[PDB]
């Protein structure tokens, strides 16, 4: 049982590694793109106000 649990902990490193890469991709690509989306929406609100 301890050996089986050791393998589970050892294999768990893969999920943590891909999670870090997934989070890194979101910060580098998704977040800046969403900022551009919000800016365009902000301008549209002013035009609708006009």
């Amino acid at each position: 049982a301890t050996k089986a649990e050791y393998a589970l902990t050892k294999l768990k490193l893969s999920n943590e590694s891909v999670t870090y890469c997934t989070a890194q991709y979101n910060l580098s690509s998704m977040l800046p793109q969403q900022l551009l989306m919000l800016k365009n929406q902000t301008t549209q609100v002013a035009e609708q106000t006009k």
């Binding site: 943590e16 590694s17 891909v18 870090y20 890469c21 890194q24």
Partner: protein, 49 residues
């Protein structure tokens, strides 16, 4: 991937920098850490009533 292990190494070194944590180096496989008198010792000899 994506250099995940490289980031961990850099962070660990910087965070815990400035203090000594050298583990002791002791070889337990030597004869000092083993009982002398192997299978031929009188310890393993049969005790007579």
């Amino acid at each position: 991937s994506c250099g995940a292990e490289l980031e961990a190494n850099a962070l660990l070194t910087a965070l815990v920098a400035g203090e000594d944590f050298t583990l002791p180096d002791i070889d337990m496989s030597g004869s000092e850490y083993d009982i002398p008198g192997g299978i031929n010792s009188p310890i393993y000899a049969e005790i007579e009533k």
